[PDB]
Point group: C2
Chain length 130, copies 2
């Protein structure tokens, strides 16, 4: 059967998107900033990819950015709770959308939510000490 | 160090979504159909998660389904071009939306695009 190979996000501006993800530890060569397509190889070989809007329009010419809630989220795990709070403050200070400030989630994790430059939700979390 | 642990999708109906993904090789127990949240482990330990709209609104009350083009796409790899065509045909026959029929993409892969039950774009591909 098939295997999940890539999770790809559509970006209005490659440089601005990669800039955000680099702050989250994704390894992306500076040069990628000017590319129409970029991809980073993650654990197990699965890749996270980025494709510019103009690039997406090659097969979906009528594509237009959506408005509203997220249908997709990428969750980043941190070594401890303080790291979560620190990264959230860093991203918010950098002008990114702080959706839900750090809090002790009822499911047992220090949790926080921000949105990337294109409206995708990005969760930051760390297991709460037991 | 920050590491991507999960990729998650918001679903209106868990059972319907899992039904579609089970047809794409994702191993998911039947009991997950009744859960408010589900996780499937992929390679490298990364997990794909499904959260019902209700689950999302429990901590994100203002969430509203988006309107407009897709913000993302999940791409599934097949062993050969024939299997891509076969899967596209199968899913379309099964009532799922066929977005773009199979073709030989400029990037060197047999490619086809369908939509899952929640309108998400799902790419099917194989090296030529
Ligand atoms: Cu090559």
């Amino acid at each position: 059967s098939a295997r999940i190979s890539l999770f790809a996000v559509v970006v209005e501006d490659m440089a601005k998107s990669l800039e955000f993800y680099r702050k989250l530890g994704v390894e992306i060569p500076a040069e990628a900033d000017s590319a129409p397509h970029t991809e980073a190889v993650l654990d197990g070989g699965i890749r996270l990819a980025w494709d510019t809007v103009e690039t997406v329009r090659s097969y979906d010419p009528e594509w237009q950015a959506p408005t509203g809630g997220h249908r997709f989220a990428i969750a980043f795990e941190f070594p401890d709770t303080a790291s979560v709070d620190k990264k959230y403050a860093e991203l918010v200070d950098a002008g990114y959308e702080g959706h839900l400030k750090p809090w002790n989630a009822v499911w047992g994790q220090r949790y926080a939510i921000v949105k990337d430059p294109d409206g995708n939700v990005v969760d930051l979390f760390a297991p709460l000490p037991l």
